[PDB]
């Protein structure tokens, strides 16, 4: 495709956060395929580095301008554009550990402009999180539904670990257009988030992630 959201597109991210009191800032640019669903990042940490905390817990911060989407699914987020949309998150983790997220969206030149804020807290010193045991997340399924004139996701996440188990979330996330646009019905969106490479510290991060909508539970 279309003449606002190309089937090429660039992004820039900005992220502030603090988790348990840390703070710091990120940096990235990412390009993706809007209408394949697939996109690409390079983060880069600019403040508060070397962060003491699993980085991924911020990978599913820096995008669904980017998930394919048939025919007879409205893409309530594409529609949203030029002006864009807000999102905010919550991330409540199995041992106590919470996640929350504030993200701005808007198109400035051409290219994707997020702005992202986060909060993390109550992560326990010992846990997987603080200790820095998790190794990514397995691929996960959002269930998409309107509500209250927004679009709402709720998923169940799962981190894998060093020792081979696994450390669980639960996602809430509500997406809102900055203009009234045709809101979905309930569908799937099924996604896989991959860090692809990583310096030893984890200040400079390459993201991928694949995601698309069906009505399918397959």
Known sequence: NMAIIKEFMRFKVHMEGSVN??????????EGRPYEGTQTAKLKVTKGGPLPFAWDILSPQF???????????PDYL???????????RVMNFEDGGVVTVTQDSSLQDGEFIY???????NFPSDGP???????????????????????????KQRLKLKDGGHYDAEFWTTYKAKKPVQ????????IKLDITSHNEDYTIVEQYERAEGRHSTG
């Open 63 to 73: 995008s669904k301008a980017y998930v394919k989407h048939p025919a007879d699914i």
């Open 183 to 190: 809101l979905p019905g309930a569908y799937n969106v099924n």
């Open 21 to 30: 009191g840390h703070e710091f800032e990120i940096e990235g640019e990412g």
């Open 129 to 155: 999180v603080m200790q820095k045991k998790t190794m990514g997340w397995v691929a996960s399924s959002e269930r998409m539904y309107p509500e209250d004139g927004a679009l709402k996701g709720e998923s």
């Open 115 to 121: 702005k992202v804020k986060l909060r993390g807290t």
């Open 78 to 88: 594409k529609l949203s554009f030029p002006e864009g949309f807000k999102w905010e």
